[PDB]
Paper text:
B. miyamotoi encodes two separate bbk32 orthologs denoted fbpA and fbpB; however, the activities of these proteins are unknown. FbpA and FbpB both bind human complement C1r and protect a serum-sensitive B. burgdorferi strain from complement-mediated killing, but surprisingly, differ in their ability to recognize activated C1r versus zymogen states of C1r. The crystal structures presented here of FbpA-C and FbpB-C show that a defining feature of the C1r-binding domains for BBK32 and B. miyamotoi Fbps is a four-helix core with an extended second alpha helix that presents a functional arginine residue on a small surface-loop.
A structural overlay of FbpA-C, FbpB-Δ5C, and BBK32-C shows that the three proteins retain an overall similar structure around the conserved R248 residue (BBK32 numbering). However, we noted that the area near BBK32-K327 involves a minor structural alteration in FbpA-C and a more major alteration in FbpB-Δ5C. More strikingly, the structure of FbpB-Δ5C has a significantly altered secondary structure in this region when compared to both FbpA-C and BBK32-C. Specifically, FbpB-Δ5C shows a loss of secondary structure within alpha helix 5 that accommodates a loop insertion sequence (i.e., residues Q394-Q405), which are not conserved in both BBK32-C or FbpA-C. Furthermore, a proline residue (P397) in this sequence interrupts the alpha helical secondary structure in FbpB-Δ5C. A portion of this unique loop structure in FbpB has apparent increased disorder in the crystal structure, indicated by weak electron density surrounding residues 401-403 in this region of the protein. We have previously shown that residues on the fifth alpha helix of BBK32 interact with a non-active site loop on C1r known as the B-loop. FbpB-C blocked complement activation but, surprisingly, was ~80-fold less potent than FbpA (IC50 = 1,900 nM) despite having similar high affinity for activated C1r-CCP2-SP. Unlike BBK32/FbpA, FbpB fails to interact with zymogen forms of human C1r but instead selectively binds and inhibits the activated form. However, in our serum sensitivity assays, where B. miyamotoi FbpA and FbpB were produced ectopically on the surface of B. burgdorferi, both proteins conferred significantly greater protection to B314 than FbpA DA or the vector-only control. These data suggest that within the physiological context of complement activation on the spirochete surface, FbpB’s inhibition of activated C1r is sufficient to prevent downstream complement activation.
Author numbering: 269 to 354, 356 to 400, 404 to 426
Write the structure that this text describes.
Amino acid sequence: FKLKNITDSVEQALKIAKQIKDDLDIIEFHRIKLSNHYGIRAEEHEKQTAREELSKFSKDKLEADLKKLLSEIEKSLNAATILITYDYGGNLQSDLSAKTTLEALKTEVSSLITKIQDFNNKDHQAYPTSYYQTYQALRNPYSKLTLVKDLLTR
């Protein structure tokens, strides 16, 4: 029950984090077709497809996504404390590290929200691409939650 509580929330966090990461993939893919000077020549129709896809993404979508991710991380923390207090001669260090990584994620995701809200582009250009630090910061949560999941799966 308590284990399901923690692991269900982590799974919900993982899902949004994976989304963010996939969203970066989509934007990069189509942006490179639209780029006047970078990447491989695309046909006019790929370029038109790119404009329409890129219009599905905005600064607000990204902020909303991060706020949702942060909420699931904070429910993950809470569930982690319950599981932690519920000691049998000593806490598993797997449990401790999970909580530790989660605490790290929370500040890192909060920081990224504060960072992104002051971007000036409202369109897809609020999303950084790798062609840079922020690009990496945005997809780090998936890795760390992938470790949180791994640690609680015994």
